[PDB]
Paper text:
CPS secretion is mediated by an ABC transporter containing KpsT and KpsM as its nucleotide-binding domain (NBD) and transmembrane domain, respectively. The transporter partners with the periplasmic and inner-membrane-anchored KpsE subunit, a class-3 polysaccharide co-polymerase (PCP), as well as with KpsD, which is assumed to form an outer-membrane pore. The KpsMT transporter is surrounded by a cage of eight KpsE subunits extending about 80 Å into the periplasm. Cryo-electron microscopy analyses of the KpsMT–KpsE complex in six different states reveal a KpsE-encaged ABC transporter, rigid-body conformational rearrangements of KpsMT during ATP hydrolysis and recognition of a glycolipid inside a membrane-exposed electropositive canyon.
In a nucleotide-free state, our cryo-EM analyses resolve two apo KpsMT conformations (Apo 1 and Apo 2). In the Apo 2 state, the NBDs are closer together and slightly shifted against each other. A similar arrangement has been observed in the crystal structure of the isolated Wzt NBD dimer of the O-antigen ABC transporter. Accordingly, the KpsM subunits move towards each other by about 12 Å as compared to the Apo 1 state, reducing the separation of the membrane-embedded subunits and narrowing the electropositive canyon.
Residue numbers in the entry:
A (entry chain A): 1 to 226
B (entry chain G): 47 to 49, 72 to 144
C (entry chain F): 3 to 48, 72 to 176, 321 to 369
D (entry chain C), F (entry chain D): 14 to 269
E (entry chain K): 340 to 370
G (entry chain L): 340 to 369
The structure:
């Protein structure tokens, strides 16, 4: 169960408060896959960050009784001067995971990353792909009830993308996923319900096709505005 | 005063001395007087207490302050 | 490193908190012996050099031999068989006797008056007062002899030695409390350090 | 999952995380942090030995200097590393159950443990040289040290919360700390300065704390008038209440 | 003191030439 | 495109870049860079006025203290901001036609201009109070100031090149600068300290520079023996040659 | 003092050698 109660989030600008959400109250459907769609700047990424706990709402709150993951593939939470083994160890201490569990978590991340000796080298020497790989491994290291993706399927090379797709296909049936993607084929394949974000309001569609049609109609209406 | 600082600081030491306490207890019966308030158990001299505790109580009840810029002893 | 992770918590808890306090409580409440204190406050007058010589002379060896001849300090200090730490074991060396005596009598002097205070410990209050009185008399004789040997001056006793009623130095509860504080701090530091070495 | 267990886990993670940054990667930060006190000891012993001998012929310079210098080092370290705690780990707030107060108190406990180690080492090497190291009254010394630690941590937390989104204030408080080295009378005994400027110097709580620590540490140490523990204790309590209240008021804005 | 002055002036001139040449090279390194 | 022209353009750009960063975002940095000297003026005047009166009845404390304190502030600012120049703009070397030496000399000229402005303001406010401000021999003062500036910039560049890829050295040189405040004798006249420690204190070049600046600034100021300009001048020249040579050797490795 | 003088001369020779080594590394850079 995920609920946004009185969620009001704004951005500080010199011309005033750029409000993104105003008194947003919305209940996510339970034990289903969610496709968060909307226009550019409508508020998909910030809502995903609010769900993942990266950014706290200015007003209201998010109430959840299930585990919500961080953006998968995000390298912003790392330390450049700290190596990957100590980084995933620190993330393990964040969630209070036991020593044996941390060991395998570390071994699993190291084996999935396929980086090598640079696994004992810090992120300030890493590239974008290396950071994406280690972030993806640290994301899969924990069994989350909900996994959040924002265009994380286009990272890495073809082999890494295929490995991630196979892993997530094996994961399907064990955990839920909130996906923010501009490609509606992925929404049709991976998501069971659709949540459209527009003008600070979230609308739920139990049918993926209906939500896609509604978003396309909203885009056409926006383009038709003179 | 004669007819310096050494004699008045000797007095400062001597006011809290045990011999002066014995002389004053002989003269004025301090043990009997300081045990009269029975309703106050915190600032009273309990009966049958040790000599060291009696000396500590007397040193608490008499306050001696030294003014060095004037060399004056204030006894309260 | 195999035993480094084997210290866990309960072993460290036991061997760093409860056993030392068991032995400390056992020693203080049973094995300890009372040590009465006699306090005197003296000065020398016709002069910081003179009370400096006196302060050196109180803890000297010749005064210790004179006092041992007079009052038999070695026999007196060996009586408390119950206390093994603060008793003077028989057949010990002369240097250890001097160190023990220097520990028993504490000599202090204020800088703004020159008053020299002495506190003498003993297992019997009358013996402590007698030792303090003998120390004062020998000091007076010493300064008079030093004045006479060159060819005038007398000791001033602001506070004569007292006869104690109860002992004051073997404080058991205050020592237990400061042991609690020190033990907890030592636990905290060593547990933090064992945590960070184990995490490595 | 009670809040206490996750709080303890994240505190331990932050603490060791800080320990890694503050200490050298080659495990050599202890060398510099032990060099910091000995240089001051050397320069003050070569610069004010005879002045202290003229001051009082009762307490030797090295122990009297250490017993005031190390608590002052603890205080300045607490303030400095506490005021910079929040604006050093902005990324780490991305994870849930992190908070800024956990970072500031992890830095506080790291500084406390490190300076306690330094104090114990200094006392050991002082006793190895034939000096006097054993405190006559250790309970009063422990209480005074606890009050000083609480005051330093409270001031550091207050400066961390108040001077958010203005680094420049952090630049000036440091220059306020330099005169406090001489105002507090840690180096030279305060018994020598004439009374004409005493009351203005009695408003420094760390001065009262240092003299009370020295009095509880040394046998027969004369403490002058108006050096009560009540004033620094009330200062520390009021500042801690104010800092906690200000952090509670500005909670989500500090996380950002 | 002819020899001491001559040696000191030689060392000083060598250092000055080294500094000037290094500054000139640093200025030239902007292509 | 001559190398001097592009060098001047990038220096002006880098110069204003350092300016924006050093000065406040609300055009307020002048306030604190004027507040730093006056606090030290106040505390030293309230702490050592009668001591200076007992020292010599010829020169009043404010002008004598300013004329030594401002050059010392310039020297310490040069060293501190110069040694941190390379490891503050690591994202600036991505563009070509730029070098770390450009950043260090832009910071040097910014510090020189700021401290020159502060010195002129202090001299003006000193002459507005009826004191003596006009230098009796300004050319010798200018030469001494130039030597001190070159020595400070050279030391800062040397510490910038040498202590790359080890920030911990930058942690300790600060603690090496605090005793230098009292060693140099800027606050109190050096004529009062006994000669028993003079030969150890004559190895400080900034001491010689400060006494020579005071001698060239004041009429009939007695300079003690062994305060020749030759020693600090040779120190500055040798250090500048060494620093430029070390930069030239480690040129490509510095920028990364 | 033969050994003290030899140690001092060794130290100053090592310092001189280091200085000329860095100088000759600098000039050799084209």
């Amino acid at each position: 169960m995920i609920e946004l109660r009185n969620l009001t989030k704004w951005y500080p600008t010199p011309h005033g408060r750029r409000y993104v959400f105003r008194n947003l109250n919305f209940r996510f459907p339970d034990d289903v896959s969610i496709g968060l769609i909307g226009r550019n700047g409508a508020g998909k990424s910030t809502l995903m960050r609010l769900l993942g706990g990266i950014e706290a709402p200015n007003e209201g709150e998010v109430v959840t009784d299930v585990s919500i993951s961080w953006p998968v593939g995000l390298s912003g939470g790392f330390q450049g001067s700290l190596t990957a083994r100590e980084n995933v160890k620190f993330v393990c201490r964040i969630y209070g995971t036991s020593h044996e569990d941390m060991l395998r978590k570390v071994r699993f991340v190291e084996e999935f990353a396929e980086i090598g000796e640079h696994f004992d080298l810090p992120m300030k020497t890493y590239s974008s792909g290396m950071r994406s790989r280690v972030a993806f491994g640290l994301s899969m290291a924990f069994d989350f009830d909900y996994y959040l993706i924002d265009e994380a399927m286009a990272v890495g090379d073809a082999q890494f993308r295929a490995k991630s797709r196979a892993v997530f296909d094996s994961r399907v049936g064990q955990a839920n996923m909130i996906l923010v993607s501009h490609n509606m084929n992925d929404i049709k394949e991976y998501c069971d319900v659709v949540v459209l974000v527009d003008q600070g309001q979230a609308t739920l569609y139990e049918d993926v096709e209906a939500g896609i049609a509604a978003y396309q109609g909203s885009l056409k209406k926006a383009a038709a505005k003179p | 005063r004669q007819t310096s600082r050494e004699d008045t600081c000797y007095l400062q030491t001597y006011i809290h001395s045990m011999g002066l306490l014995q002389k004053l207890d002989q003269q004025l019966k301090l043990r009997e007087h300081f045990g009269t308030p029975l309703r106050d158990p915190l600032f009273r001299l309990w009966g049958g207490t040790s000599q060291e505790w009696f000396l500590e109580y007397y040193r608490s009840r008499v306050e001696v302050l030294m003014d060095d810029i004037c060399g004056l002893l204030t006894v309260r | 490193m195999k035993l480094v992770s084997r210290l866990t918590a309960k072993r460290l808890q036991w061997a760093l908190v409860y056993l030392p306090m068991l032995v400390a409580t056992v020693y203080f409440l049973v094995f300890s012996a009372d040590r009465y204190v006699s306090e005197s406050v003296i000065t020398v007058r016709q002069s910081r050099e003179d009370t400096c010589y006196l302060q050196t002379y109180i803890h000297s060896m010749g005064l210790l031999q004179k006092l041992d001849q007079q009052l038999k300090l070695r026999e007196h200090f060996g009586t408390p068989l119950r206390d093994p730490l603060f008793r003077l074991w028989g057949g010990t060396s002369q240097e250890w006797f001097l160190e023990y005596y220097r520990s028993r009598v504490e000599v202090l002097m204020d800088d703004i008056c020159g008053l020299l205070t002495v506190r003498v410990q003993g297992f019997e209050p009358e013996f402590a007062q007698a030792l303090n009185r003998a120390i004062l008399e020998e000091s007076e004789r010493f300064v008079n002899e030093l004045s006479h040997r060159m060819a005038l001056k007398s000791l001033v006793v602001v506070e004569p030695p007292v006869l104690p009623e109860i002992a004051e130095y073997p404080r058991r509860w205050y020592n237990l409390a400061t042991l609690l504080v020190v033990c907890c701090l030592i636990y905290g530091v060593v547990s933090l350090v064992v945590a960070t070495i184990r995490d490595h | 999952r009670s809040p206490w267990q996750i709080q303890q886990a994240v505190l331990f993670a932050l603490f060791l995380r800080e320990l890694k940054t503050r200490l050298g990667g080659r495990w050599l930060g202890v060398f510099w942090v032990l060099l910091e006190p000995v240089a001051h000891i050397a320069v003050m012993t070569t610069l004010f030995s005879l002045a202290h001998r003229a001051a009082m012929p009762s307490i030797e310079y090295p122990v009297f200097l250490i017993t005031g210098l190390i608590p002052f080092f603890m205080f300045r370290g607490l303030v400095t590393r506490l005021m910079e705690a929040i604006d050093s780990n902005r990324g780490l707030f991305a994870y849930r159950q992190v908070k800024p107060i956990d970072t500031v108190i992890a830095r506080a406990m790291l500084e406390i443990s490190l300076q306690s180690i330094v104090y114990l080492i200094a006392l050991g090497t002082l006793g190895w040289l034939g000096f006097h190291f054993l405190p006559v009254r250790a309970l009063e010394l422990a209480g005074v040290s606890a009050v000083l630690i609480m005051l330093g941590a409270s001031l550091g937390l207050f400066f961390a919360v108040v001077t958010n989104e203005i680094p420049q204030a952090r630049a000036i408080v440091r220059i306020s700390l330099l005169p406090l080295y001489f105002v507090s009378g840690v180096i030279f005994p305060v018994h020598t300065i004439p009374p004409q400027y005493l009351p203005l110097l009695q408003l420094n709580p760390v001065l009262h704390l240092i003299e009370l620590s020295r009095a509880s540490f040394f046998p027969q140490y004369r403490v002058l008038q108006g050096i009560n523990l009540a004033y620094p204790a009330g200062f520390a309590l009021l500042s801690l209440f104010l800092a906690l209240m200000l952090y509670r008021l500005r909670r989500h804005q500090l996380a950002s | 003191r002819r020899w001491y002055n001559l040696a000191t002036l030689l060392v000083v001139c060598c250092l000055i030439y080294g500094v000037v040449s290094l500054v000139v090279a640093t200025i030239r390194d902007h292509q």
